[PDB]
Amino acid sequence: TKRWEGGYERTWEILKEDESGSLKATIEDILFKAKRKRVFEHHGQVRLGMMRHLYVVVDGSRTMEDQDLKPNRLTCTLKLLEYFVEEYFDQNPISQIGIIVTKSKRAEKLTELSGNPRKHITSLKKAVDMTCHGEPSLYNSLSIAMQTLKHMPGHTSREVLIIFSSLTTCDPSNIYDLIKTLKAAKIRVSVIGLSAEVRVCTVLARETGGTYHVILDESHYKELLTHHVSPPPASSSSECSLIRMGFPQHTIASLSDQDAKPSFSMAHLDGNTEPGLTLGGYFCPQCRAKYCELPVECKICGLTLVSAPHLARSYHHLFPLDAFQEIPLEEYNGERFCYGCQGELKDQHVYVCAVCQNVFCVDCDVFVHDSLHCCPGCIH
Amino acid sequence: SPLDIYPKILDFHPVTMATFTMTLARVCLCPMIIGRGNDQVAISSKFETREDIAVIRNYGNLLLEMSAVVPDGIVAFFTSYQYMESTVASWYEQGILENIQRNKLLFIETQDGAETSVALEKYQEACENGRGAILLSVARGKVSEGIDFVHHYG
Amino acid sequence: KVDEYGAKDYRLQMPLKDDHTSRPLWVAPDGHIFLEAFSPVYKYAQDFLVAIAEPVCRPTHVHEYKLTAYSLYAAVSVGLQTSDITEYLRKLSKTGVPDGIMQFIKLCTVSYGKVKLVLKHNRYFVESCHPDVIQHLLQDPVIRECRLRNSEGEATETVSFEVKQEMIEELQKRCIHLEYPLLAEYDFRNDSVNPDINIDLKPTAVLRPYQEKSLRKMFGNGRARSGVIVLPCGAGKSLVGVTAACTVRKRCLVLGNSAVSVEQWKAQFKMWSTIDDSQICRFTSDAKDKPIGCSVAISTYSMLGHTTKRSWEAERVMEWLKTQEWGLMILDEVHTIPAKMFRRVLTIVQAHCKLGLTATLVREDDKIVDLNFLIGPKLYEANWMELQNNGYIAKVQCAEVWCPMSPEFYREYVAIKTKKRILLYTMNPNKFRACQFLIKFHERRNDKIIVFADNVFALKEYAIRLNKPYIYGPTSQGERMQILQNFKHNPKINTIFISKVGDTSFDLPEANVLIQISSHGGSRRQEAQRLGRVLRYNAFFYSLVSQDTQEMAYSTKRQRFLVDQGYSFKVITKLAGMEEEDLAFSTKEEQQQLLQKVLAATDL
Ligand SMILES: [Zn+2]
Ligand SMILES: [Zn+2]
Ligand SMILES: [Zn+2]
């Protein structure tokens, strides 16, 4: 049989009248039910993460000159890569990104593996005017990625992302041995092709544990990149994994005090133009090196400089707020004012925290569970 | 396909005349017939036009720009060994076969059984990785029915 | 009733406004329903009103529905009874039901199941539960010719008699005039006379909830009745027909309008029904895939109603086809059913259920009312606004941008009146510049463009000027097919011109920009169909008209259907960057040269 071949649904039977005007109670109930449409979780997915050293491999062959994506594959790929880098650094505080470009059967490490977002974006913008020639070489790119990631600590999740536009790759040696070596190195490899499915890419993704996808259009490309943004799940406890990192306070300098000390920035010193000799900035807690951007690993002492709010923004996942107990207004024998907004309690249901036993209205409960992530009563 | 010619080619009395077409969640095959080329000239393998330069150039261009869209192996069939060798010689004479070579590897099937076997083996091993390859053969050859081009092959 | 301000005022008629505003509904004495969309009970009220009345306008805030006899017949066809509908209408009134609506509803709903029309052994019979109505309609002179030979009393069991097969339309037309409407209910669950086929749709063709409502309303109590389902072309229309055919599980007949729509229906069946090619046959004198002995047969109009000598193979196929019953005869593009030759196609074949599907039910010559008894009542009418709000239909930003008439053309426009002015405002240089600017702007952003244009004579110089592909319309079959095939998967070419050919249900690929110039006179159906070719602000379509010409009135009068559907036409008077780049007809020399070639027609 079929679900639609039975009886016609009569949804209007829900409403009923008993006092010639009780429809107001029904519409009030409908309005109350309309709220609380969320699961009280902004993400609802992975509640933790792990440090990722992600390498992005970009094809630079003649196939990038194709105009499947306006204006050409290279420009759209670089723009979406800039967006991906921005989002990935936004959602990963202590992750690192390296960029490799394959061209003319060779691989060039365009950018070093680091956590600076501006440097990667600058390199990508510079690479827009490159020359597309030759054929890609997956073997060389994977060899470079493995050599760079061979010495990385085990607790970090080593991931390699390949954007393969051309359907042909030139390998100076056997590639399956390299795939076995990568599998022994526990390196995750994911490939996002553009033209069609390639057997070698699928085999590599399956053996290394990654995912292989093929782009349908620019929207699908962006969706795949956004899916790759999310960090992989992490084990409960792996090893003694830690890292010595500093928290440089943003100490500016004012000429009113006698300690107005100008200093050239370490990052700006390598530029062709005159480095910005600003009044102040971020001073390294270890060697007093001055930096303008964060998070940037210190050039002098090798210390990692991170911003504390960025790390703290994900702390609510570690200690999620328990759902409040829903109690009807009639059954609660106490104050009729919300503890959070001081508003009068007129809703049919009142929510009470299990810890401090305070009273919160529907709006305040939703605000606490969605944005505040902390019970105001428990703070006191 | 013709169920009316087999009963009369050999003395036969069929009572079935039954055909079946496979169906899947998606169309697994995309047959298409290519007529005139980019020059609006027919690419028919006519006997009077076997030595024609235009048709050979169109065939080479089709095999070139086709080799860059379908990866990991393309199986091409020609009318005869003589026509196949005359076509590949003309392609080698022009600066066109190198463009196909730099995309996919070219393997030619010959009458030698051992040579054909080793050519098939190297074609398979080249299609295993991302190099890709082209297998040129003849319709009326022992390699046409001796092997099956399973998925990811051809 | 009073005309103090020229408005029909019924303040005194319905004062029942007890408490206070919770019912989002208003009734009218003669008949009308007003619904407030911004109410918490909006969905339930919509579900109730759709099953009982058809809409007349669906803007963003206040919907307006109309009560008709056929709407009440459809409502009582479903399990809803008189008491339920009356009590729920009174439940949500906020003003009180006038004592002119209850009587009308009672009269409409009382005489619903009294008379039925049934088909058995290739014989049409009329069966009545109450024997008195047989004598009541016996005195009607027109009914007496249906019986042959005079059908004494057909004493069975319940009084019935046979009727003439070729004159079934006349008795159907007379019965509603006699306030005894006929119903076409086919209880396919228990037939045991029909060789039910093994059709079964694959369990992977999921359907949206809006199609679920229409399908459920079609099968209310285990039986299928004839009706009309209106869904947009971009939405899923053929899927509903395929699902209905699978559920009926009987021999299906599909009728299309064009010789290419039969291929579309065959593809839909091959995609969402899991039926072997042996059973599926197309009868259009093109391949002749042995239509004799088939489960589902797909053909087109203008061939089942031939008034001339028919082909020998076609004659034999028609003779075979007119000798057996059909289950769920499916009609496509039902809006153009009430024609001189298309109506008799219904009477030339015998079928139990007649299911008609269309996207643009609007038609001139007020022949849609005839379709109420030709096939059945208006079953489902999709709400396009909420359909596009779900994101499954492209939110097309409708535009109505006009261009001033150039002086070199307006003198000739006002000088001539003998129908020669059609080309004049069609070939307006300003409209040409606006169209070229829109084409270039949308090509610079890589958007697919379809340009509709009637008056193919103008379209010739309109398309050859820009050196762009165009479909004259009688070009060929292959050329149009290859042009449309390479139109979608080619970045080099993304704009085509169509001359009234795209005014039906074709396989045109997805497009985002539509620019129509010099369309038909007042065909709301044509504009609705053209708008349907874009949806599938994801997209937007423009209409170009010439000011101070009949095109202004035509565009105003042909958009009243879409505004009832909820679309709003923003007026654009200035185009940004008109002089930024170079366009055709920049100087007056070529503009005045155009006058000689546009007056060179002289078709006398
Ligand atoms: Zn330092
Ligand atoms: Zn509160
Ligand atoms: Zn608390």
Side-chain angles (χ1 to χ4, degrees), chain A residues 1-44 46-380, chain B, chain C:
Chain A
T1 60
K2 301 303 178 180
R3 61 177 63 90
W4 58 83
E5 74 177 21
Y8 183 73
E9 299 288 348
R10 302 116 171 275
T11 59
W12 59 91
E13 253 65 16
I14 297 182
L15 54 93
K16 290 297 299 301
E17 277 284 352
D18 67 327
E19 61 183 2
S20 69
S22 66
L23 193 68
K24 184 173 298 181
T26 62
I27 64 180
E28 178 181 358
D29 186 16
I30 294 301
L31 291 178
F32 175 83
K33 201 68 59 181
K35 302 179 181 179
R36 306 174 58 86
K37 50 90 180 180
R38 290 299 307 272
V39 77
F40 296 156
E41 232 291 338
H42 67 84
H43 180 53
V46 190
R47 306 306 175 92
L48 68 159
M50 199 157 55
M51 292 202 300
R52 310 167 56 184
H53 299 351
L54 179 60
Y55 257 106
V56 177
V57 178
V58 188
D59 187 9
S61 62
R62 52 186 177 182
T63 58
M64 281 296 188
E65 298 290 342
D66 194 1
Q67 301 179 355
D68 296 353
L69 310 179
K70 295 303 179 181
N72 45 17
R73 293 183 177 181
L74 180 59
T75 304
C76 180
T77 297
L78 290 183
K79 171 184 177 181
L80 291 188
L81 276 181
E82 295 172 1
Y83 158 77
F84 167 81
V85 168
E86 293 181 359
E87 186 69 21
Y88 174 84
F89 274 147
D90 180 71
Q91 296 187 10
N92 294 265
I94 331 180
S95 64
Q96 298 178 354
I97 281 193
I99 296 182
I100 307 181
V101 177
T102 170
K103 167 186 176 180
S104 302
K105 303 185 299 180
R106 292 186 176 183
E108 303 176 0
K109 182 178 179 179
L110 180 61
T111 312
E112 297 286 333
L113 182 62
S114 59
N116 193 326
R118 291 191 182 181
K119 182 179 180 181
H120 300 347
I121 297 181
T122 303
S123 58
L124 289 181
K125 291 181 178 179
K126 178 182 179 181
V128 178
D129 300 329
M130 71 165 57
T131 299
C132 302
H133 186 54
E135 311 173 36
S137 175
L138 291 180
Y139 183 86
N140 299 128
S141 303
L142 289 183
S143 301
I144 292 184
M146 181 184 62
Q147 182 269 351
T148 303
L149 298 179
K150 182 179 181 180
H151 314 284
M152 294 307 170
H155 55 80
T156 55
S157 65
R158 293 172 289 269
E159 305 178 14
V160 175
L161 180 63
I162 300 180
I163 301 177
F164 206 46
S165 178
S166 176
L167 304 178
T168 64
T169 169
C170 300
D171 308 336
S173 179
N174 184 21
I175 188 179
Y176 287 84
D177 303 330
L178 182 56
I179 300 184
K180 295 180 181 180
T181 311
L182 292 183
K183 177 58 181 179
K186 303 179 181 179
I187 299 182
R188 183 184 183 93
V189 183
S190 301
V191 182
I192 302 181
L194 289 78
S195 297
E197 174 184 357
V198 188
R199 175 62 179 178
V200 58
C201 298
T202 300
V203 172
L204 174 61
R206 181 180 182 180
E207 186 167 347
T208 53
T211 62
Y212 175 68
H213 289 279
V214 175
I215 296 166
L216 288 178
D217 58 327
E218 189 172 2
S219 63
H220 197 190
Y221 199 173
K222 190 172 183 178
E223 291 182 6
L224 292 175
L225 292 184
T226 305
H227 178 62
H228 274 68
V229 167
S230 178
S235 300
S236 182
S237 180
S238 63
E239 256 293 338
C240 65
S241 61
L242 285 173
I243 173 176
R244 275 273 260 86
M245 52 175 49
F247 308 96
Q249 48 277 0
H250 187 181
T251 48
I252 326 182
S254 181
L255 233 67
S256 61
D257 307 330
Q258 297 183 359
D259 302 333
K261 307 171 184 181
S263 304
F264 287 84
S265 178
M266 298 294 102
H268 294 60
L269 278 181
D270 300 332
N272 302 22
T273 335
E274 296 81 10
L277 55 156
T278 59
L279 295 165
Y282 297 90
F283 289 83
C284 176
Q286 186 172 0
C287 66
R288 296 304 173 183
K290 176 186 179 181
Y291 299 94
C292 299
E293 312 165 3
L294 285 185
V296 171
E297 177 263 4
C298 188
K299 303 294 183 179
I300 298 180
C301 62
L303 194 65
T304 306
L305 302 186
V306 198
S307 181
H310 296 176
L311 300 175
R313 193 160 301 183
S314 61
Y315 285 173
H316 70 270
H317 297 282
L318 303 183
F319 311 96
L321 214 288
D322 308 333
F324 292 160
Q325 295 77 211
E326 182 173 347
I327 294 180
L329 173 59
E330 52 181 2
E331 292 185 3
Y332 185 85
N333 301 269
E335 302 177 357
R336 295 189 175 184
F337 294 152
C338 177
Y339 185 77
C341 75
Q342 210 189 10
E344 184 175 359
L345 297 178
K346 294 185 176 182
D347 298 330
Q348 301 179 359
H349 299 263
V350 180
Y351 301 90
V352 179
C353 177
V355 179
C356 48
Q357 293 79 34
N358 286 131
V359 270
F360 299 93
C361 59
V362 186
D363 308 331
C364 276
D365 168 68
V366 171
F367 171 78
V368 168
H369 291 355
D370 295 3
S371 300
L372 187 51
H373 299 171
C374 296
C375 186
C378 302
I379 300 181
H380 300 172
Chain B
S1 33
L3 284 317
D4 53 355
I5 187 176
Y6 283 89
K8 52 183 52 58
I9 279 184
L10 34 79
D11 295 330
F12 193 68
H13 299 271
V15 299
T16 74
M17 302 287 92
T19 57
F20 307 96
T21 159
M22 60 165 56
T23 180
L24 280 316
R26 67 201 188 281
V27 278
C28 60
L29 70 161
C30 184
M32 60 181 182
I33 299 175
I34 298 182
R36 76 280 184 180
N38 301 333
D39 308 332
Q40 277 63 28
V41 286
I43 64 180
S44 176
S45 66
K46 216 170 189 178
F47 182 83
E48 290 74 12
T49 64
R50 296 198 303 179
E51 301 292 338
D52 196 332
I53 180 62
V55 294
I56 267 61
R57 291 179 56 88
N58 286 30
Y59 275 165
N61 188 22
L62 162 64
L63 187 57
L64 170 57
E65 57 205 322
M66 182 60 60
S67 59
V69 305
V70 34
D72 53 85
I74 306 172
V75 186
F77 293 97
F78 292 87
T79 61
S80 61
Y81 288 98
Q82 303 291 335
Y83 183 81
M84 151 71 177
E85 65 180 9
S86 63
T87 304
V88 299
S90 181
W91 286 351
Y92 194 16
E93 187 271 346
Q94 294 184 351
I96 179 175
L97 189 137
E98 304 294 338
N99 304 87
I100 305 181
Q101 277 283 356
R102 64 168 48 88
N103 296 23
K104 307 295 191 61
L105 301 180
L106 296 179
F107 301 117
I108 296 180
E109 183 270 347
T110 58
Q111 295 79 2
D112 183 16
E115 196 278 340
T116 298
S117 64
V118 71
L120 265 50
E121 186 271 349
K122 64 176 61 67
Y123 167 85
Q124 171 179 353
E125 75 91 9
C127 295
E128 281 294 336
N129 53 317
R131 190 61 185 92
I134 314 297
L135 178 61
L136 309 170
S137 61
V138 65
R140 295 177 175 86
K142 63 181 301 299
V143 77
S144 63
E145 78 283 43
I147 58 177
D148 306 336
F149 299 105
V150 82
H151 52 262
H152 128 63
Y153 292 104
Chain C
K1 184 59 62 180
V2 197
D3 300 329
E4 66 288 347
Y5 284 157
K8 305 178 180 181
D9 46 352
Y10 311 113
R11 190 194 323 104
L12 187 63
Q13 185 70 21
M14 41 193 165
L16 295 83
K17 313 178 305 177
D18 309 327
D19 44 354
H20 181 275
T21 46
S22 300
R23 295 89 178 273
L25 197 147
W26 287 276
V27 207
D30 45 0
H32 261 95
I33 305 293
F34 294 90
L35 181 146
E36 155 189 337
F38 47 95
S39 178
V41 73
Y42 161 86
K43 50 177 58 180
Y44 311 98
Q46 244 66 203
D47 297 332
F48 171 72
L49 284 182
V50 163
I52 72 169
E54 79 291 342
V56 86
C57 79
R58 298 171 175 265
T60 178
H61 294 334
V62 180
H63 293 20
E64 187 184 0
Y65 296 73
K66 184 181 181 180
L67 288 172
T68 55
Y70 305 99
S71 58
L72 299 181
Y73 300 155
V76 73
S77 301
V78 210
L80 281 73
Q81 292 294 336
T82 312
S83 61
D84 304 1
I85 182 182
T86 49
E87 73 174 0
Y88 273 99
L89 224 179
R90 190 263 171 270
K91 186 70 60 59
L92 300 85
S93 68
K94 104 181 300 178
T95 186
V97 282
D99 203 338
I101 293 295
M102 311 301 297
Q103 304 177 1
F104 177 81
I105 290 182
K106 221 71 59 181
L107 293 183
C108 292
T109 191
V110 155
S111 60
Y112 160 71
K114 299 182 179 301
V115 183
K116 314 178 182 61
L117 182 137
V118 72
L119 179 62
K120 176 179 179 59
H121 302 168
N122 314 87
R123 302 289 300 275
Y124 280 90
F125 297 108
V126 35
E127 186 275 342
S128 69
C129 182
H130 307 266
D132 56 352
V133 70
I134 299 300
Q135 291 87 26
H136 291 43
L137 61 89
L138 182 62
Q139 289 76 210
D140 204 324
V142 299
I143 308 183
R144 285 192 277 269
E145 289 87 26
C146 300
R147 298 183 301 271
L148 212 165
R149 182 155 55 184
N150 300 91
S151 185
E152 34 273 8
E154 195 65 21
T156 55
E157 177 66 24
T158 301
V159 177
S160 61
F161 57 94
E162 59 86 22
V163 295
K164 192 175 301 179
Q165 188 271 351
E166 66 95 7
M167 210 197 307
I168 183 181
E169 182 269 352
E170 186 67 22
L171 61 92
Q172 287 183 349
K173 185 176 182 178
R174 180 60 65 177
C175 82
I176 54 177
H177 174 268
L178 296 183
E179 292 291 340
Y180 290 134
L182 264 58
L183 53 90
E185 289 284 347
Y186 182 54
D187 194 0
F188 61 97
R189 309 297 293 105
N190 42 9
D191 292 326
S192 69
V193 190
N194 194 264
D196 61 323
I197 62 178
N198 59 91
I199 185 61
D200 43 353
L201 75 165
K202 53 181 61 62
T204 56
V206 298
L207 23 69
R208 292 193 59 211
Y210 77 95
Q211 300 164 321
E212 286 269 23
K213 300 300 179 181
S214 60
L215 287 178
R216 189 176 306 272
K217 183 170 45 53
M218 279 195 57
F219 313 98
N221 53 332
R223 296 95 55 85
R225 60 267 185 174
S226 58
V228 180
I229 278 76
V230 181
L231 301 175
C233 295
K237 178 177 60 60
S238 301
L239 173 60
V240 173
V242 175
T243 53
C246 293
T247 52
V248 169
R249 204 71 176 275
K250 300 297 181 172
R251 304 175 60 176
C252 178
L253 176 60
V254 181
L255 298 180
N257 201 337
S258 60
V260 77
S261 301
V262 296
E263 271 72 31
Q264 193 77 9
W265 283 105
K266 184 187 63 176
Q268 295 296 333
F269 276 142
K270 278 296 184 176
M271 182 181 303
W272 291 330
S273 67
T274 69
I275 180 67
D276 51 352
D277 210 339
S278 60
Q279 295 296 339
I280 289 293
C281 71
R282 317 185 320 277
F283 179 36
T284 162
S285 71
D286 67 336
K288 301 172 298 302
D289 305 330
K290 274 70 60 180
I292 314 300
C294 66
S295 77
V296 179
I298 301 94
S299 61
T300 179
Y301 305 118
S302 66
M303 187 268 307
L304 280 76
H306 254 0
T307 59
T308 62
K309 184 254 300 179
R310 207 163 305 180
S311 177
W312 183 90
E313 178 70 21
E315 181 70 24
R316 277 197 171 273
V317 172
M318 290 295 300
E319 289 179 359
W320 170 87
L321 186 143
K322 293 191 302 301
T323 47
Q324 72 284 43
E325 310 170 5
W326 289 96
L328 192 77
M329 195 265 294
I330 294 182
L331 308 91
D332 195 1
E333 303 184 16
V334 78
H335 54 271
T336 168
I337 274 302
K340 189 60 180 180
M341 73 164 298
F342 293 160
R343 296 176 62 174
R344 53 168 293 186
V345 180
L346 281 75
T347 65
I348 207 177
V349 300
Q350 44 190 184
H352 294 278
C353 181
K354 305 174 182 178
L355 174 59
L357 293 80
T358 187
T360 77
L361 197 53
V362 56
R363 189 186 189 276
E364 284 72 15
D365 309 331
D366 55 77
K367 290 185 178 180
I368 297 301
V369 184
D370 300 329
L371 186 139
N372 293 321
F373 64 86
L374 283 183
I375 290 189
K378 184 188 306 181
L379 253 50
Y380 191 86
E381 179 75 15
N383 180 19
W384 293 18
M385 300 306 298
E386 75 180 7
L387 204 63
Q388 76 173 0
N389 287 329
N390 296 153
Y392 294 84
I393 295 301
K395 182 174 56 184
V396 45
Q397 185 183 8
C398 302
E400 189 265 334
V401 32
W402 53 54
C403 306
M405 284 290 297
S406 62
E408 287 72 15
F409 276 74
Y410 203 77
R411 280 292 304 275
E412 279 66 25
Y413 173 78
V414 301
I416 194 59
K417 199 257 178 182
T418 58
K419 289 298 296 181
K420 297 183 63 62
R421 60 190 180 277
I422 309 298
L423 277 307
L424 235 27
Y425 56 79
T426 297
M427 292 306 300
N428 192 318
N430 313 335
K431 186 166 59 60
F432 193 98
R433 296 180 59 85
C435 178
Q436 183 181 5
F437 163 78
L438 293 179
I439 290 299
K440 295 206 304 183
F441 167 77
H442 295 99
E443 284 186 352
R444 284 201 292 265
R445 58 173 304 181
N446 189 36
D447 288 3
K448 296 297 182 179
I449 311 173
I450 299 183
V451 182
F452 277 84
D454 198 358
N455 198 319
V456 68
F457 177 84
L459 179 60
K460 281 293 292 184
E461 51 265 11
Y462 217 99
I464 68 179
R465 190 60 55 93
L466 289 80
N467 189 25
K468 311 185 75 61
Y470 65 96
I471 295 186
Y472 201 100
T475 63
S476 82
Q477 176 63 27
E479 176 76 13
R480 290 157 46 174
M481 285 304 303
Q482 66 93 2
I483 285 179
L484 303 181
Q485 211 276 344
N486 67 77
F487 167 79
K488 50 167 185 175
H489 53 58
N490 196 336
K492 297 301 179 180
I493 171 60
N494 52 84
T495 304
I496 47 180
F497 291 80
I498 309 296
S499 59
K500 204 177 182 179
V501 178
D503 297 4
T504 163
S505 299
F506 280 176
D507 59 330
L508 288 178
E510 288 71 17
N512 300 333
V513 182
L514 188 142
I515 303 176
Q516 56 170 349
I517 45 176
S518 68
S519 175
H520 220 336
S523 50
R524 295 167 289 181
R525 164 203 59 85
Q526 182 186 48
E527 260 202 356
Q529 281 171 313
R530 293 183 179 185
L531 179 63
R533 312 313 296 266
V534 185
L535 38 81
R536 74 280 185 273
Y537 283 144
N538 299 88
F540 34 80
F541 104 99
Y542 310 86
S543 62
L544 311 184
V545 292
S546 300
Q547 313 186 37
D548 308 331
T549 54
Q550 300 176 177
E551 251 185 359
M552 286 292 308
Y554 285 161
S555 181
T556 301
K557 76 173 302 178
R558 74 192 302 166
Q559 290 180 359
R560 54 185 176 181
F561 182 80
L562 300 183
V563 303
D564 293 1
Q565 290 290 339
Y567 295 91
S568 61
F569 285 87
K570 179 177 180 178
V571 174
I572 303 180
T573 172
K574 300 183 184 184
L575 307 189
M578 169 54 59
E579 295 295 335
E580 178 184 3
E581 67 283 349
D582 199 329
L583 287 316
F585 306 136
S586 58
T587 71
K588 195 259 300 181
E589 208 287 88
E590 63 278 10
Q591 291 187 5
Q592 68 176 352
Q593 185 269 354
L594 225 182
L595 269 305
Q596 306 298 330
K597 63 181 303 180
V598 76
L599 269 68
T602 62
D603 296 332
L604 300 180

